[PDB]
CSV table of C-alpha atoms in Angstrom, one decimal:
chain,number,residue,atom,x,y,z
A,1,UNK,CA,-111.0,-105.1,17.6
A,2,UNK,CA,-114.7,-104.6,18.1
A,3,UNK,CA,-115.9,-101.0,18.8
A,4,UNK,CA,-116.1,-100.0,22.6
A,5,UNK,CA,-118.0,-96.7,22.2
A,6,UNK,CA,-117.0,-95.7,25.9
A,7,UNK,CA,-113.4,-95.4,24.7
A,8,UNK,CA,-114.2,-93.0,21.9
A,9,UNK,CA,-112.7,-89.5,21.7
A,10,UNK,CA,-113.9,-86.9,19.2
A,11,UNK,CA,-112.2,-83.8,20.3
A,12,UNK,CA,-110.4,-83.4,17.0
A,13,UNK,CA,-113.6,-83.4,15.0
A,14,UNK,CA,-115.0,-80.6,17.2
A,15,UNK,CA,-111.8,-78.7,17.3
A,16,UNK,CA,-113.4,-75.5,15.8
A,17,UNK,CA,-117.1,-76.2,16.3
A,18,UNK,CA,-119.3,-75.9,19.3
A,19,UNK,CA,-121.4,-79.1,19.5
A,20,UNK,CA,-122.5,-82.3,20.9
A,21,UNK,CA,-122.3,-85.9,19.7
A,22,UNK,CA,-124.0,-89.0,20.9
A,23,UNK,CA,-123.4,-92.5,19.8
A,24,UNK,CA,-125.5,-95.4,21.2
A,25,UNK,CA,-124.5,-99.0,20.7
A,26,UNK,CA,-127.9,-100.7,20.3
A,27,UNK,CA,-126.7,-104.4,20.8
A,28,UNK,CA,-124.3,-103.9,23.7
A,29,UNK,CA,-126.5,-101.1,25.2
A,30,UNK,CA,-123.7,-98.6,25.7
A,31,UNK,CA,-123.5,-94.9,24.9
A,32,UNK,CA,-120.8,-92.3,24.2
A,33,UNK,CA,-121.7,-88.6,24.9
A,34,UNK,CA,-119.4,-85.7,23.9
A,35,UNK,CA,-120.6,-82.3,25.6
A,36,UNK,CA,-123.4,-83.5,27.9
A,37,UNK,CA,-124.3,-79.9,28.9
A,38,UNK,CA,-125.2,-79.1,25.2
A,39,UNK,CA,-126.8,-82.4,24.7
A,40,UNK,CA,-129.3,-81.5,27.5
A,41,UNK,CA,-130.2,-78.0,25.8
A,42,UNK,CA,-133.5,-78.0,24.0
A,43,UNK,CA,-133.6,-76.5,20.5
A,44,UNK,CA,-135.9,-76.3,17.6
A,45,UNK,CA,-135.9,-79.6,15.6
A,46,UNK,CA,-136.0,-78.0,12.2
A,47,UNK,CA,-136.2,-80.6,9.5
A,48,UNK,CA,-135.2,-83.5,11.7
A,49,UNK,CA,-138.9,-83.2,12.5
A,50,UNK,CA,-139.6,-84.8,9.1
A,51,UNK,CA,-139.0,-88.2,10.7
A,52,UNK,CA,-141.9,-87.6,13.2
A,53,UNK,CA,-144.1,-86.1,10.6
A,54,UNK,CA,-143.7,-89.0,8.4
A,55,UNK,CA,-144.4,-91.4,11.1
A,56,UNK,CA,-147.7,-89.7,12.2
A,57,UNK,CA,-148.7,-89.1,8.6
A,58,UNK,CA,-148.4,-92.7,7.5
A,59,UNK,CA,-150.0,-93.8,10.9
A,60,UNK,CA,-153.2,-91.8,10.4
A,61,UNK,CA,-153.2,-92.5,6.6
A,62,UNK,CA,-152.8,-88.8,5.6
A,63,UNK,CA,-150.3,-90.2,3.1
A,64,UNK,CA,-150.2,-93.7,1.6
A,65,UNK,CA,-146.6,-94.7,1.5
A,66,UNK,CA,-143.2,-93.4,0.8
A,67,UNK,CA,-144.2,-92.9,-2.8
A,68,UNK,CA,-147.3,-90.8,-2.2
A,69,UNK,CA,-147.2,-88.0,-5.0
A,70,UNK,CA,-148.0,-84.3,-4.3
A,71,UNK,CA,-147.6,-82.3,-7.5
A,72,UNK,CA,-145.5,-79.1,-7.4
A,73,UNK,CA,-147.6,-76.0,-7.9
A,74,UNK,CA,-145.0,-74.4,-10.1
A,75,UNK,CA,-143.8,-71.8,-7.6
A,76,UNK,CA,-140.0,-71.3,-7.6
A,77,UNK,CA,-138.8,-71.7,-4.0
A,78,UNK,CA,-135.4,-71.5,-2.4
A,79,UNK,CA,-133.7,-74.6,-3.6
A,80,UNK,CA,-134.1,-76.1,-7.0
A,81,UNK,CA,-134.6,-79.8,-5.8
A,82,UNK,CA,-137.8,-78.4,-4.1
A,83,UNK,CA,-139.2,-77.2,-7.5
A,84,UNK,CA,-140.5,-80.6,-8.7
A,85,UNK,CA,-143.3,-83.2,-7.9
A,86,UNK,CA,-142.4,-84.9,-4.7
A,87,UNK,CA,-143.3,-88.0,-2.7
A,88,UNK,CA,-143.0,-88.5,1.1
A,89,UNK,CA,-139.7,-90.2,0.7
A,90,UNK,CA,-138.3,-87.8,-1.9
A,91,UNK,CA,-139.3,-84.8,0.2
A,92,UNK,CA,-137.4,-86.2,3.2
A,93,UNK,CA,-134.3,-86.9,1.1
A,94,UNK,CA,-134.3,-83.2,-0.4
A,95,UNK,CA,-135.9,-81.8,2.8
A,96,UNK,CA,-138.8,-80.2,0.7
A,97,UNK,CA,-140.4,-78.4,3.5
A,98,UNK,CA,-143.5,-77.4,1.4
A,99,UNK,CA,-144.5,-81.2,1.1
A,100,UNK,CA,-144.3,-81.8,4.7
A,101,UNK,CA,-146.3,-78.7,5.6
A,102,UNK,CA,-149.1,-80.0,3.4
A,103,UNK,CA,-148.8,-83.3,5.4
A,104,UNK,CA,-149.0,-81.5,8.7
A,105,UNK,CA,-152.1,-79.5,7.7
A,106,UNK,CA,-153.7,-82.9,6.7
A,107,UNK,CA,-152.7,-84.6,10.0
A,108,UNK,CA,-154.2,-81.6,11.9
A,109,UNK,CA,-153.8,-80.3,15.5
A,110,UNK,CA,-155.5,-83.1,17.4
A,111,UNK,CA,-153.8,-86.0,15.8
A,112,UNK,CA,-150.5,-84.1,15.8
A,113,UNK,CA,-150.7,-83.2,19.4
A,114,UNK,CA,-151.8,-86.8,20.5
A,115,UNK,CA,-149.2,-88.8,18.8
A,116,UNK,CA,-146.4,-86.3,19.6
A,117,UNK,CA,-147.3,-87.0,23.3
A,118,UNK,CA,-146.3,-90.7,22.8
A,119,UNK,CA,-142.9,-89.8,21.7
A,120,UNK,CA,-141.8,-87.6,24.6
A,121,UNK,CA,-140.7,-85.1,22.0
A,122,UNK,CA,-139.2,-82.3,23.9
A,123,UNK,CA,-141.6,-79.6,25.0
A,124,UNK,CA,-144.3,-81.0,22.6
A,125,UNK,CA,-145.5,-77.4,22.0
A,126,UNK,CA,-147.2,-77.0,18.5
A,127,UNK,CA,-148.7,-73.7,19.4
A,128,UNK,CA,-146.6,-72.0,16.8
A,129,UNK,CA,-149.0,-73.3,14.1
A,130,UNK,CA,-149.9,-76.7,12.5
A,131,UNK,CA,-147.5,-76.1,9.5
A,132,UNK,CA,-144.9,-73.9,11.4
A,133,UNK,CA,-144.2,-75.3,14.8
A,134,UNK,CA,-141.1,-77.3,14.1
A,135,UNK,CA,-139.5,-74.4,12.0
A,136,UNK,CA,-137.7,-72.0,14.4
A,137,UNK,CA,-140.9,-71.9,16.5
A,138,UNK,CA,-142.6,-73.3,19.6
A,139,UNK,CA,-141.4,-76.9,19.5
A,140,UNK,CA,-138.0,-77.6,21.1
A,141,UNK,CA,-136.1,-80.9,21.9
A,142,UNK,CA,-132.7,-81.6,23.3
A,143,UNK,CA,-130.2,-83.9,21.7
A,144,UNK,CA,-130.5,-86.4,24.5
A,145,UNK,CA,-134.3,-86.3,24.0
A,146,UNK,CA,-133.7,-86.9,20.2
A,147,UNK,CA,-131.5,-89.8,20.9
A,148,UNK,CA,-134.1,-91.4,23.2
A,149,UNK,CA,-136.7,-91.1,20.6
A,150,UNK,CA,-134.7,-92.5,17.8
A,151,UNK,CA,-133.6,-95.4,20.0
A,152,UNK,CA,-137.2,-96.4,20.4
A,153,UNK,CA,-137.8,-96.1,16.7
A,154,UNK,CA,-134.7,-98.4,16.0
A,155,UNK,CA,-136.1,-100.8,18.7
A,156,UNK,CA,-139.8,-100.3,17.4
A,157,UNK,CA,-140.8,-99.7,20.9
A,158,UNK,CA,-143.2,-96.9,20.0
A,159,UNK,CA,-147.0,-97.3,19.5
A,160,UNK,CA,-146.9,-96.9,15.7
A,161,UNK,CA,-147.7,-99.7,13.4
A,162,UNK,CA,-144.4,-101.8,12.8
A,163,UNK,CA,-144.6,-101.3,8.9
A,164,UNK,CA,-145.0,-97.6,9.3
A,165,UNK,CA,-141.7,-97.5,11.4
A,166,UNK,CA,-139.9,-99.7,8.8
A,167,UNK,CA,-141.0,-97.4,6.0
A,168,UNK,CA,-139.8,-94.3,7.8
A,169,UNK,CA,-136.4,-95.8,8.7
A,170,UNK,CA,-136.1,-96.9,5.0
A,171,UNK,CA,-136.7,-93.3,3.8
A,172,UNK,CA,-133.9,-92.2,6.0
A,173,UNK,CA,-131.3,-94.2,4.3
A,174,UNK,CA,-128.5,-92.0,2.9
A,175,UNK,CA,-125.8,-94.4,1.9
A,176,UNK,CA,-125.9,-98.2,1.2
A,177,UNK,CA,-122.4,-99.6,1.0
A,178,UNK,CA,-121.0,-103.1,0.9
A,179,UNK,CA,-120.4,-103.2,4.6
A,180,UNK,CA,-122.7,-100.6,6.2
A,181,UNK,CA,-125.9,-98.6,5.8
A,182,UNK,CA,-126.0,-95.0,6.9
A,183,UNK,CA,-129.5,-93.4,7.9
A,184,UNK,CA,-129.9,-89.8,8.6
A,185,UNK,CA,-131.8,-86.5,8.4
A,186,UNK,CA,-130.2,-83.1,8.6
A,187,UNK,CA,-131.7,-79.8,10.1
A,188,UNK,CA,-130.5,-76.2,9.9
A,189,UNK,CA,-131.4,-72.8,11.0
A,190,UNK,CA,-129.8,-69.7,12.4
A,191,UNK,CA,-126.5,-71.4,13.0
A,192,UNK,CA,-127.8,-74.6,14.6
A,193,UNK,CA,-127.2,-77.7,12.7
A,194,UNK,CA,-128.6,-81.3,13.4
A,195,UNK,CA,-127.7,-84.6,11.8
A,196,UNK,CA,-129.6,-87.6,13.4
A,197,UNK,CA,-130.0,-91.1,12.3
A,198,UNK,CA,-128.5,-94.7,12.4
A,199,UNK,CA,-125.7,-96.7,11.2
A,200,UNK,CA,-126.0,-100.5,10.7
A,201,UNK,CA,-122.7,-102.5,10.0
A,202,UNK,CA,-121.9,-106.2,9.8
A,203,UNK,CA,-120.9,-106.3,13.4
A,204,UNK,CA,-123.4,-103.7,15.3
A,205,UNK,CA,-126.0,-101.2,15.0
A,206,UNK,CA,-126.0,-97.7,16.3
A,207,UNK,CA,-128.0,-94.5,16.9
A,208,UNK,CA,-126.3,-91.1,16.6
A,209,UNK,CA,-127.3,-87.5,17.4
A,210,UNK,CA,-125.1,-84.6,16.3
A,211,UNK,CA,-126.0,-80.9,17.0
A,212,UNK,CA,-123.5,-77.9,16.3
A,213,UNK,CA,-123.4,-74.1,16.1
A,214,UNK,CA,-123.1,-74.5,12.3
A,215,UNK,CA,-125.1,-75.9,9.4
A,216,UNK,CA,-126.7,-79.3,9.1
A,217,UNK,CA,-124.1,-80.0,6.5
A,218,UNK,CA,-121.3,-79.4,8.9
A,219,UNK,CA,-123.2,-81.5,11.5
A,220,UNK,CA,-123.4,-84.4,8.8
A,221,UNK,CA,-119.6,-84.0,7.9
A,222,UNK,CA,-118.6,-84.1,11.4
A,223,UNK,CA,-120.7,-87.2,12.1
A,224,UNK,CA,-119.3,-89.0,8.9
A,225,UNK,CA,-115.8,-88.2,10.1
A,226,UNK,CA,-116.4,-89.8,13.4
A,227,UNK,CA,-117.9,-92.8,11.9
A,228,UNK,CA,-115.1,-93.2,9.4
A,229,UNK,CA,-112.4,-92.8,12.1
A,230,UNK,CA,-113.9,-95.7,14.2
A,231,UNK,CA,-114.3,-97.9,11.1
A,232,UNK,CA,-118.2,-97.9,10.9
A,233,UNK,CA,-118.1,-96.3,7.5
A,234,UNK,CA,-115.8,-98.2,5.2
A,235,UNK,CA,-117.0,-99.1,1.8
């Protein structure tokens, strides 16, 4: 009764949404892809880039750990959850862009470019500016390239320190149930939505990448519906 990802079908979940979905079974080494053409199209990563930003920032000690506090300046920004003191981990959870812009400025161009080159991270183009390049700007990456990177993060086959990789994966936890742990990060801009991450169950471990012509919230809802359908999200 164990999941064979090659027999999946997600047509129903995408009935009224243009998008792509990738699920990689880490232990069997098997992948399901819906809409391979779209999976190959590069797009701006938006806030899915926080995963990379956090890895590089911890690696070069621009931030100390998931609890490194940056005080809010008191400026009311677009979402109330941004208008508070944040840590590296809480700013990932709430997608507080201002925190990760300060982090990118501290990382700086040279270290950002060098470490981004180790990840095969799409076109690796940061010319849009040190604190702007992942936000509807120069950097683009395809869903397949996101999957390849996240698979290497899951396997810790990246040149980062191992504790750095474990901290960033922990910061991505969205739900810890009795029988599964869901990891993920959303991105959204101009009718393109991402939800990328991992799910660990009692019987397997998986990487997923979802990208849609809709919000990141929609991308996440589609992903959760698929993972529920195939019994990976239960309780």
